Design a protein around this ligand. Structure first.
Ligand SMILES: CO[C@H]1[C@H](O)[C@@H](O)[C@@H](O)O[C@@H]1C(=O)O
Ligand SMILES: CO[C@H]1[C@H](O)[C@@H](O)[C@@H](O)O[C@@H]1C(=O)O
Ligand SMILES: [Co+2]
Ligand SMILES: [Co+2]
Ligand SMILES: [Co+2]
Ligand SMILES: [Co+2]
Ligand SMILES: [Co+2]
Ligand SMILES: [Co+2]
Ligand SMILES: [Co+2]
Ligand SMILES: [Co+2]
Ligand SMILES: [Co+2]
Ligand SMILES: [Co+2]
Lengths: 701, 700
């Protein structure tokens, strides 16, 4: 195996007793419909059932045979219509489905039924997933519908095909041969995403290139959209707010200028002439040298609404990305609550800083009550070790979605807020920055596939656990052997926390080398902005560490609902895993463990390395259950991870020691090298990413 | 089929009668030896014979069975030794081999016999190739030995994994996971190269990163060298001449400074501790802001010899890379004889820079006391990146069979390289392949054929482009004669088509600078005139061409007298080179009867028609090719035709604007005007990750 199939591995069921049972239950595949989407579902079931059941199962439209899988909607399949599903289908809406073992004219059947063709597609993938994961079909009766409307992936891909925060190869999109060459991989990409119910893609970098709106590129993009359409995936583009100027058509991009308004309306007309079901726009504006409305003295609602007005006649939406930097997004956007148009959705990262290994929830989610919102999670491992560290992100996503905000009573979880139940809003969604590439296994590190998987599962149902998604993924990707699943599932579940522990435990954050983000640099000071440095966030000194965000410091806690401000502001109740986000504490503060804060910091850094070492031992125990190639690859990558984790640990412990002046407790292995040595390693250790200039650095001392 | 196997496709022989014959001839595989290299040969034969013959053939060391393939050297295989092959075998040297149907102890056998283990490996690949190309084994008796010593590939790969002039993905070398992860692909890379007898690789860019010589990277590089070693491929590195300074160890890199001499000696000792059979260095120096000896007021021999002295105790070599036309010749000729015996001057086929046709580099006929090797380009820097179909076999054949008259008749470029003209110590050729992580290694499927042809010609420089194409098509696509003939001819015309729609008649250097994707024959006003196009063509209202005769730059005087004579005389100069050497009036009448203006138009239009004919030919092959590669090549040919039209229109309209002559009415008038094509040059996507032009946001 080389990862190309990801979790859609349609190999014969290994449990021979179970295989025989499936073979008895599904002897035929009945498909009456013939739309592109139903055809895609039929093709997936034909290849999937044939592979899993080890016999030729061909989709046919013929008189119903005993022991058939029958798929369709009441509108395209008279067999489905005859069951008179009624209210049972009503609950499923536009994208849901019902899977059920039943009878049609005394024939034994399993149905995949829906209101829409895309619901049939999603249900077909779930039916395959039940078999892939060795679940029984006898007495099957289940229905499901997605809990969020816009379930999207994001690709930070430059048109030169280098991917920003891209650790898995070049951009999938081969502009040089588009629109002429419809590569099979474009269809495989659509299959991967549709298998999770992902229904949208933003294919181009948020650091946006205006060329994507030119005819030259719209023709190429349309060819991708055509490949994606049968699988239910709408096309979206990141836009450059200054495009009217870049195209030399208008001497300003001010959204209140009628010529600018018209430029975008005319451009939307052009887009929809190529892509009649185009989803809309992703916008990064006035952030990091990206142009925006504030460049013309206008606010973000004025800019978003101008774009939204251009898209509204075509049914498009705008995904608008949202002294103490922690306070920034909330302070910028809270005054605009209620000012955005109904087809604008504010796309907000899980936390207020930037995808750090642990962040508290973004206060905007509990504060904006009159604005559509959507979550943005990161899959690509910008902060979790590129393609060389194993870091299943399921637990990060779950932790986020199940976080209680107390916005409006108990049950105001991030997930319930996203679903729209808390504040009663129109558009809902989640976006996942996946940044795959042309590597054979799409994601570089095999385990990044598990993070993509969990994100799509959770976008469908935000209460799905990291454990459940890992169990599925492991079954689908590797093995159904219980003795494999349990230890590898636990290895996955600990991997995120390991990555917190050897980098920045206890509420520490932003300790990375700038701007490449591969390795440690907790000493970083003196950049163009203080909030780019590490020292700004940790504030370590001889007496203590941490950033005071209570009422006696920046009072960022007042940005949160009262119950959260209260819990996090009191040392007696604040979780230790967030503590240094909100409190500057003396090194002698005693933690729950009985250690002082210095000792606890050291313990966590050393624990992260030990957790990696334990993952290595776990993986080595699985040799009998995994193919030799992927086995060897993951074993090797875990060796790289352990070496880097040691570098992280030694770099940060020695750095913080240099500031606190306390000894590393004697039981721990003392670093043989000094802090200067680790500063030298930070300057000289290869940064394994094509995009960031640090990978080209010739510094050797 | 996704290209990953390239030409090593071990699928059952499609001709059922032939398949049965092979199955009767090779029923067993006998391998007595067990060195890493013999094991690699055995593994290749096991997978290849099993695939091709559609039955399990397992390498064994057991009592000889009737109808066996028996491989080895006299030293490792008593069966082979028992044949007492003597002089016939020994004459094939350290890399040659004998393939022969014979008998041993009354058993019917086919032997793969050699003097060395790598010779067994090479012969094993040829044995497989005979089967793959549906050649008969009955009465087989054939021997071969390579005609050049150093048969190397070059990769212009940056350590960030972006490839310079790289149109086939990221660099293969995954530095972030090395040395720990020995990816299967590293072994497959070695297999591909060893199947052609390629015995060296320079893995990193000539625009050299000094970190390759650090312990951090040497550890990584050694892991690659380890993967390559069983396949007979030595590791080489491009070096940065300023490394002593970059490492902070010396405040100069002057090769006459004893501290510099010692720095390189110590560094070589370090390298050879990691890689005991390290091949040596490739060097690009004092070229385009690359550091070199001239930066310290020293000459290229002083610089090369300093590096060479560091490598000599370990048996390593230095591949030193060599009116702009007269540059090279005038720079190295004074140094002929001044280079050490482990220095080899690596010279591009022509004096400019891999242009679609160039006259031979005069250095090849001039340097009579210096080791030389050829450098050819496979990656399509000047032939359309990964979107154009351009088999390069004809370019390499054209070069290698060129008579130079260096020491009278018989002084072909190939004979010079081989050491038959000037007595020499080291011989070779280097091929700039620049593959990457794309599934098919080369982006465009047909770039594989160029890599193939280069490897066959490095082994035997008299192999034709046609012979190499025949083999590659059989191995890669189909053995059906009705397929082979038209697709072979399509391949053979593809180079010339790429000359014709870009720069026929001796025109050159008409590309967009510095990305090189599209036309820009109007380019003037760069920091150096010899970067522009107009410098080369000198087009005016009265004529076109560059005078390199005795009345102009006299570059022809750099060639042997019979070439200077032939090319200086309008009566004998080949028309396909004419504007390299003569500035001619537009009314000059060509052999066709057209005037030069008319002939220029005819050639540009011919190139487009040649691409359209390639399209029609390919469409006729749908029955013989798998659906996926069929569709891919079909689509790429559409892109190529669109780009060829852009090239033709841009250049014809440009030259028209200068000559002020009409395009004859039997040619289709361009869709738009010259300004429109200047706009398309600014705005047409440049499909390469490396060159900054692919990031250009210019829209007008
Ligand atoms: C795509 O830009 C990224 C950027 O690479 C990273 O440094 C950070 O600033 O986040 C940005 C974002 O989320 O837009
Ligand atoms: C690798 O550098 C190349 C360069 O990309 C190209 O522009 C030309 O100058 O040739 C150089 C060379 O052959 O060294
Ligand atoms: Co994988
Ligand atoms: Co870039
Ligand atoms: Co919506
Ligand atoms: Co574990
Ligand atoms: Co202490
Ligand atoms: Co191919
Ligand atoms: Co680069
Ligand atoms: Co030699
Ligand atoms: Co043809
Ligand atoms: Co005329």
């Amino acid at each position: 195996e080389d990862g190309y199939d990801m979790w859609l591995r349609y190999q014969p069921i290994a449990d021979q007793t179970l295989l025989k049972t499936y073979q008895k239950q599904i002897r035929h595949l009945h498909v009456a419909g013939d739309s592109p989407t139903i055809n895609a579902a039929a093709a997936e079931l034909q290849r999937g059932l044939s592979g899993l059941l080890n016999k030729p199962i061909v989709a046919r439209d013929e008189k119903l045979k005993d022991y058939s899988l029958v798929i369709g909607t009441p509108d395209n399949s008279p067999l489905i219509a005859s069951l008179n599903l009624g209210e049972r289908l009503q609950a499923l809406g536009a994208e849901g489905y019902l899977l059920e073992q039943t009878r049609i004219n005394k024939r034994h059947v399993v149905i995949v039924a829906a209101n829409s063709d895309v619901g049939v597609l999603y249900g077909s993938f779930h039916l395959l997933r039940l078999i892939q994961t060795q679940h029984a079909l006898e007495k099957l009766s289940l229905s499901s519908a997605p809990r969020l409307q816009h379930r999207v992936v994001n690709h930070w891909d430059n048109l030169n095909r280098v991917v920003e925060r891209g650790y898995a190869g070049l951009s999938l999109w081969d502009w040089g041969s588009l629109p002429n060459y419809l590569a099979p991989r474009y269809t495989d990409y659509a299959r991967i995403n549709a298998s999770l119910g992902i229904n949208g893609t933003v294919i181009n970098n948020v650091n946006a290139d205006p060329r994507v709106l030119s005819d030259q590129f719209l023709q190429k993009i349309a060819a991708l959209a055509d490949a994606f359409r049968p699988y239910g995936i709408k096309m979206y583009l990141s836009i450059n707010f200054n495009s009217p100027r870049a195209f030399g058509d208008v001497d300003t991009a001010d959204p209140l200028d009628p010529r600018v308004q018209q430029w975008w309306k005319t451009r939307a007309q052009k887009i929809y002439s190529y892509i009649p079901d185009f989803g809309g726009f992703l916008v990064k504006a006035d952030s990091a040298g990206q142009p925006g409305p504030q460049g013309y003295g206008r606010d973000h609602a004025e800019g978003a609404n101008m774009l939204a007005a251009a898209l509204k006649p075509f049914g498009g939406v705008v995904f608008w990305r949202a002294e103490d930097r922690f306070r920034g997004a909330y302070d910028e956007f809270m005054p605009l609550d209620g000012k955005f148009a109904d087809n604008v959705i504010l796309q907000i990262k899980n936390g207020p800083i930037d995808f750090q290994p642990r962040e508290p929830f973004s206060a905007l989610f509990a504060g904006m009550s009159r604005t559509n919102m959507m979550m943005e999670f990161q899959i690509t491992q910008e902060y979790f070790g590129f393609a060389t560290h194993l870091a299943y992100q399921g637990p990060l996503f779950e932790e986020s979605l199940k976080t209680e905000t107390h916005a409006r009573g108990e049950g105001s979880t991030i997930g319930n807020i996203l679903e729209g139940k808390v504040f009663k809003t129109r558009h809902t969604g989640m976006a996942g920055v996946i940044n795959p590439g042309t590597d054979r296994n799409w994601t570089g590190h095999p385990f990044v596939q598990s993070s993509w998987y969990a994100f799509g599962r959770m976008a469908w149902d935000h209460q799905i656990s990291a454990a459940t998604a890992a169990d599925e993924w492991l079954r689908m990707t590797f093995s159904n052997q219980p003795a494999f699943i349990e230890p590898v599932k636990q290895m996955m579940l600990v991997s995120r926390e390991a990555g917190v522990n050897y980098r920045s435990p206890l509420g520490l954050t932003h300790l990375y080398s700038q701007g490449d983000h591969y390795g440690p640099a907790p000493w970083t000071d003196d950049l163009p902005r203080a909030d780019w440095t590490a020292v700004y966030y940790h504030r370590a000194s001889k007496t203590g560490i941490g950033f005071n965000r209570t009422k006696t410091g920046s009072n960022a806690l007042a940005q949160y609902p009262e119950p959260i401000a209260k819990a996090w502001g009191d040392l007696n109740s604040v979780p230790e895993d967030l503590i240094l986000w909100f409190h500057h504490l003396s090194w002698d503060h005693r933690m729950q463990s009985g250690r002082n804060l210095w000792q606890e910091l050291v313990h966590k850094y050393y624990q992260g390395v030990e957790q990696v070492r334990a993952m290595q031992r776990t993986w080595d125990q699985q040799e009998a259950y995994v193919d030799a190639a992927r086995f060897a690859q993951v074993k090797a990558l875990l060796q790289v991870q352990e070496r880097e984790a040691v570098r992280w640990r030694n770099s940060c412990v020695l750095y913080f020691q240099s500031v606190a002046g306390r000894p590393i407790p004697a039981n721990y292995e003392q670093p043989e090298h000094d802090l200067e040595y680790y500063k030298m390693l930070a300057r000289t250790t290869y940064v394994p990413e094509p995009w960031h200039p640090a990978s080209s650095s010739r510094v050797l001392k």
